[PDB]
Design a binder for this molecule. Structure first.
Ligand code: NI
Length: 349
């Protein structure tokens, strides 16, 4: 039994187009899409006011399609999981830094996380890399002054994600900019033929953060969407795929994977455990993480017994199924941290 998973590069607020194109796939091949994964520049602007948070050049200060979906005028026909890129309503994603549905059928993975679906474990790393900002905390609530920095990937995700392949493998990992160096691991000449501008960066092209995470977790697949081209490469056991932007034929591809089980979208248990155990570093809602704490030090405290109780409590308060919630995003931010804190404090440490 096989599951077909649509994989998409940059959406740029072309949601209706994306869906029509996925619809054409099912009509043209007779296959069913199990779900969709998108690697960024989602531009999930709820209303005109959010334009303030979209860092783009003036000619691209456009609302796009998302608000139709946010309003219920359109309805996404496939469960769509995504990470943030560099063109985002960054305020919305910060409210949802711990993940959340931006609307029915569209689930944001957060700054980073692992989820479960159909027997798969899927890791996500949002943003693009700029060294000047990799140790910057998030400040909350969102401020228009933060438009330039919110979408830069922080170094700390490396510590949050690095233990996630201890108990089983990672099937797919998602990022926006490419893992640094991976450009060298495919037919780069053929690529430079089409993207001569990529050539100056040499092996340094891409995110050192994503390089480390890939070298550490070694997922079956790593999927990325920043570059506006298709590209394939292999780094040991990992299949790298890059995808272009909606409107071009190299934007959408498909993974045909064994389906061992059909199972609703779920929080990953190891991820939940990391999330709870790192709470002390995230305890200040106005500014996090507090890196006077050591993330890996906090995660070193994980135990079999402790993990079990954590999952038990998560199941009690939040549930393992990731379910649609229509409260406003600022309400969700407070609600998810409330329970993370409550769980942590129930552990007694
Ligand atoms: Ni991008």
């Amino acid at each position: 039994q096989i599951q077909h998973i649509a994989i998409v590069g940059s959406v740029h607020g072309k949601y209706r187009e994306m869906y029509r194109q996925l619809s054409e796939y099912e009509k043209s091949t007779g296959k069913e899409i199990s779900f969709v994964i998108c690697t960024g520049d989602m531009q999930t602007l709820r209303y005109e006011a959010d334009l303030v948070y979209l860092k783009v050049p003036p000619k691209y200060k456009q609302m796009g399609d998302f608000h139709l979906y946010y309003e219920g005028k359109e309805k996404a026909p496939y469960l769509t999981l995504f990470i943030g890129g560099n063109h985002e309503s960054s305020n919305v994603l910060l409210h949802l830094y711990n993940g959340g549905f931006v609307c029915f059928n569209m689930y944001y993975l957060g700054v980073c996380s692992c989820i479960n679906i159909n027997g798969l474990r899927i890791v996500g790393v949002s943003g693009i890399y700029k060294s000047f900002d990799e140790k910057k905390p998030y400040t909350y609530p969102p401020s228009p002054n933060d438009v330039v920095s919110l979408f830069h990937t922080r170094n700390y995700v490396i510590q949050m994600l690095s233990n996630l392949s201890q108990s089983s493998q990672i099937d797919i990992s998602l990022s926006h900019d490419w893992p640094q160096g991976i450009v060298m691991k495919g037919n780069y000449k053929q690529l430079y033929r089409f993207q001569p501008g990529f050539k100056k960066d040499g092996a340094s092209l891409g995110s050192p953060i994503n390089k480390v995470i890939l070298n550490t977790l070694k997922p079956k697949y790593w999927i990325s969407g920043h570059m506006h081209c298709e590209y394939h490469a292999e780094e040991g056991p990992t299949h790298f795929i890059a995808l272009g932007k909606i409107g071009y034929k190299n934007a959408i591809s498909y993974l045909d994977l064994p389906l061992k089980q059909k199972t609703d979208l779920e929080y990953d248990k190891d991820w939940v455990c990391n999330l709870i155990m790192t709470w002390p570093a995230f305890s200040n809602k106005a500014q996090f993480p507090d890196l006077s704490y050591s993330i890996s030090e906090l995660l070193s405290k994980r135990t079999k017994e402790l993990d079990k109780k954590i999952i038990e409590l998560w199941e009690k308060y939040i549930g393992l199924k990731i379910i649609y919630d229509s409260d406003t995003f600022d309400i969700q931010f407070t609600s998810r941290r409330f329970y993370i804190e409550k769980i942590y404090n129930e552990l007694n440490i």
